[PDB]
Amino acid sequence: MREIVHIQAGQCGNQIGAKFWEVISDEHGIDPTGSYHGDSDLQLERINVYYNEAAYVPRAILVDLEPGTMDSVRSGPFGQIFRPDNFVFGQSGAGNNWAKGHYTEGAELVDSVLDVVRKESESCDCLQGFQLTHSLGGGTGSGMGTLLISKIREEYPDRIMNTFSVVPSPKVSDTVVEPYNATLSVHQLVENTDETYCIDNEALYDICFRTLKLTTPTYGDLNHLVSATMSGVTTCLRFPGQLNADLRKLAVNMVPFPRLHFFMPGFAPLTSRGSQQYRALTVPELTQQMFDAKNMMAACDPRHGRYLTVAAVFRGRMSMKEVDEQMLNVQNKNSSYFVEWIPNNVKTAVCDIPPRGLKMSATFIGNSTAIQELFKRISEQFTAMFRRKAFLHWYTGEGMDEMEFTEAESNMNDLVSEYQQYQDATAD
């Protein structure tokens, strides 16, 4: 359990993936040239996880059927650091079709990716797991991504499969087949990934609009919250911590039931792009803003469900004793929103190094039953179109049978019912 192989697929996958590598390369003191220019040695203590040795190069693979984002990433600020051979980009696109990426033109390219996946895996002393960034409402990241997951699953059945899946919403993209793609993709993640961070774009939009007070949010405004959230939920993996050190230990503490591995991430404080928020929030503030709905990266109210498991990560120099008092308080004061039949389900870690720009931050990771609201929302949009069989010729023309839609819809509603099932279970 050491090295993590990172993969980004599709348009959104390579967007938030490149922005994530910019963030952690700075926190680890790595300039675009690949050299280390940091100061502390804790930055190099567990650099072997995400990077390799040079002469430091990211252990990342970039995949997309459309070569458009291939050049947008290489032209980016950190585009010169990625391995040239790790770019696996096909000829034609996916047309925002899950079936084109999963069955048709993504399967024609997936073998090229597994060759690069194998390459980075052979040079690993002990492969810890995999990490995927993609969008469920797209075509390549949704379709070809879930195919890559199921392919990695059959070739690395002993490694953890972790994903950063973003959720489609009408408030962002106006493509109508996104409920189809997300339903077909959720149908895969529930049976293939060991853990999945749900990144709702409807939540990201509502945050930039109603909290950061931005009238017209752009993708850079949305991807800023994503990169911050990704940096927090990965803090314990790249810095020498005691709790939830590797991928499996985190999944063993966060996933009580195999299909219920969909996490609701949170982060505080909610900063803007290059704005001014100097005064490091107090520990009681970081705790109150962590357990609210206005800082969740998923359009779900934690009041509507119960927390099965919780992982909190504080960053920056602070009183560890003052953290315990707050984390204890929010538990015994809101005990109804925490599962009783899982003792000590909340786990808090501390890291001295804050993210660049802040002195105190706190990242939330929750396995709440309220995440069923997110699936209820997608399942409602799915059926509205599916009852009229609109745009179904897209997927049937690529080989999919109409029954596949009914099954993916059924298994999602089963996942919703199960999240409600343990929301009603008691101790007695």
């Binding site: 050491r2 590797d246 009580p256 039949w341 786990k347």
Partner: protein, 433 residues
Amino acid sequence: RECISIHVGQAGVQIGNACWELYCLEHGIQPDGQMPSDKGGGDSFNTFFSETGAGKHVPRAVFVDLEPTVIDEVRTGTYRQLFHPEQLITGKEDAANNYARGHYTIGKEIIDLVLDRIRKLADQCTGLQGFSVFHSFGGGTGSGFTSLLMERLSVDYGKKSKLEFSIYPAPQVSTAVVEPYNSILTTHTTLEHSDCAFMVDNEAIYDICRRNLDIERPTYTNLNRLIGQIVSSITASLRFDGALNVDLTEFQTNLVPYPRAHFPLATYAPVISAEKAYQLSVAEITNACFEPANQMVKCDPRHGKYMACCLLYRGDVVPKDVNAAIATIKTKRTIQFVDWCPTGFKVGINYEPPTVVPGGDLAKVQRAVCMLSNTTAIAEAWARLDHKFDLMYAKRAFVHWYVGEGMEEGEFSEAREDMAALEKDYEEVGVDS
């Protein structure tokens, strides 16, 4: 004579560090394994150390982990030259707080290598006495791999005794949710292989450090140094000679009335921080052995019945002062013995002062005492584990992880049935006739 110490997992390895550091301080051994010339001299401590031809004293210890991270610090820190590198065994992939990984999947890859390096030490001994296993209850290696090693030692070294110092979990420092699962699973498969088991509730050591040392949030170093003090007092009978220094194997004959009732309760005193000026008498440190705030497993012996009571004194301690204190406590406290026990106290004395880590958080004391009592009240610890176990297992939460690593789900049921019988066995023993 000789005793081979085995340290499994992070807890076992990190505690062995604080223990062997204290062992070296007590015996005057330097980190390079060298000692001054005798200038005979009563040099008992060879039960825990071997001698190189070049005059180097090497611990009879094995450090095992499924991950190199912890033991790498050992073969890098101050005592890198103390151990032979053949005694520091590591894997690459750990058990991820999963008993089934440490016992079935990952642990079986390295079990043959560990037993080989142990046979090396066993073949360097003229007369082996037994094994001292150091492990946790919650970690995957400390629970899974330890119980695997205990099964194999009973097959190979069947005659030899095996003692374990187990780290009872506590939420204050708990690094895993499934720790009650691992605790029940390892207590079940090790119950018929262990001769004596000294549990160490991390909550007790955590609170004793907060109360008596005035440490806000104790680190693992604080807990380990306090634990190493107790482990030293228990093993001091084997490592030193003394006219009144009763051997530990003579205490086990009184502490274990039945094979399954082999969980004594250790109570150490005095624990004083190095901040102000203090000297406690024999009667005061003997009184402190019956204050549950000084125990290493949280439970109330007044709510139970004793089967044995052993006082391991070390320091400036005179026998007549002991019997005077015992007679006072026996007629001014409520020590309930079962009606089939002799009601007597077994006393051992070691006139060497208690050693502490220099510049540490524990103060050097003139005299100290470690009480080993076999009371039914320790079954309260099993109840706290069995309860957290029952809450999750009734929903089969986290079970798929174990079943996904070679373990049949029915082994959960078997292990819980054994803990249910173990709680009945403690209930039945305390009844009169």
